[PDB]
Design a protein around this motif. Sequence first.
Motif, PDB file in Angstrom:
ATOM      1  N   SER A   1     -27.803 -66.891  25.371  1.00 61.95           N
ATOM      2  CA  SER A   1     -27.666 -68.228  24.811  1.00 61.95           C
ATOM      3  C   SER A   1     -26.830 -69.099  25.750  1.00 61.95           C
ATOM      4  O   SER A   1     -26.049 -68.589  26.556  1.00 61.95           O
ATOM      5  N   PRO A   2     -26.940 -70.428  25.633  1.00 63.35           N
ATOM      6  CA  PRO A   2     -26.060 -71.294  26.435  1.00 63.35           C
ATOM      7  C   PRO A   2     -24.581 -70.986  26.246  1.00 63.35           C
ATOM      8  O   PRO A   2     -23.824 -70.938  27.223  1.00 63.35           O
ATOM      9  N   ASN A   3     -24.148 -70.755  25.006  1.00 65.28           N
ATOM     10  CA  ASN A   3     -22.729 -70.499  24.791  1.00 65.28           C
ATOM     11  C   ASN A   3     -22.300 -69.163  25.379  1.00 65.28           C
ATOM     12  O   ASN A   3     -21.210 -69.059  25.950  1.00 65.28           O
ATOM     13  N   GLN A   4     -23.119 -68.123  25.227  1.00 67.31           N
ATOM     14  CA  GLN A   4     -22.749 -66.842  25.810  1.00 67.31           C
ATOM     15  C   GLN A   4     -22.832 -66.868  27.329  1.00 67.31           C
ATOM     16  O   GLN A   4     -22.064 -66.165  27.997  1.00 67.31           O
ATOM     17  N   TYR A   5     -23.740 -67.666  27.894  1.00 70.21           N
ATOM     18  CA  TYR A   5     -23.760 -67.863  29.341  1.00 70.21           C
ATOM     19  C   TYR A   5     -22.401 -68.362  29.826  1.00 70.21           C
ATOM     20  O   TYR A   5     -21.827 -67.831  30.785  1.00 70.21           O
ATOM     21  N   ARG A   6     -21.847 -69.358  29.133  1.00 71.30           N
ATOM     22  CA  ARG A   6     -20.516 -69.854  29.464  1.00 71.30           C
ATOM     23  C   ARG A   6     -19.444 -68.795  29.261  1.00 71.30           C
ATOM     24  O   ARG A   6     -18.598 -68.586  30.134  1.00 71.30           O
ATOM     25  N   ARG A   7     -19.426 -68.152  28.093  1.00 72.83           N
ATOM     26  CA  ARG A   7     -18.354 -67.205  27.810  1.00 72.83           C
ATOM     27  C   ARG A   7     -18.295 -66.102  28.860  1.00 72.83           C
ATOM     28  O   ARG A   7     -17.206 -65.659  29.245  1.00 72.83           O
ATOM     29  N   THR A   8     -19.450 -65.662  29.353  1.00 74.42           N
ATOM     30  CA  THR A   8     -19.431 -64.580  30.324  1.00 74.42           C
ATOM     31  C   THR A   8     -19.123 -65.058  31.736  1.00 74.42           C
ATOM     32  O   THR A   8     -18.511 -64.307  32.507  1.00 74.42           O
ATOM     33  N   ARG A   9     -19.498 -66.287  32.091  1.00 74.81           N
ATOM     34  CA  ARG A   9     -19.477 -66.707  33.485  1.00 74.81           C
ATOM     35  C   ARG A   9     -18.477 -67.794  33.838  1.00 74.81           C
ATOM     36  O   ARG A   9     -18.121 -67.914  35.015  1.00 74.81           O
TER      37      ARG A   9
END
Length: 121
Positions: A100-108
């Motif tokens: 997801s867009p939010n998990q993309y941010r949280r991981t990277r």
Amino acid sequence: SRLSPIVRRARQYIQKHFSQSDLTLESVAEFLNVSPVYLSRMIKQELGISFIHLLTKIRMEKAAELLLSTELPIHEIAERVGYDTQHYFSTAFKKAMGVSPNQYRRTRMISEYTDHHHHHH
């Protein structure tokens, strides 16, 4: 770069205008003054990918860049990559990116303006 003139011109136009939610194969064929079927076939033959997949890939890679290099809310990023609503952007991003867009941010993502030095050393 050894793309034929029509495919090179189409790719250049998409690279500049992917933010436009009305950008379609037929609309680029109008800009180039050619048959949409011819254009579709030549893009697939030379790039190995359909117009829609090429456009979507460019959009999702720009979205990934904005997710990591800005703090923009998702709905603004969606609009900046040619989606009128985050409803369609979210689904497209998950399929293209696997997250997801939010998990993309949280991981990277990381905040460059904060102190990341190891003071506990």
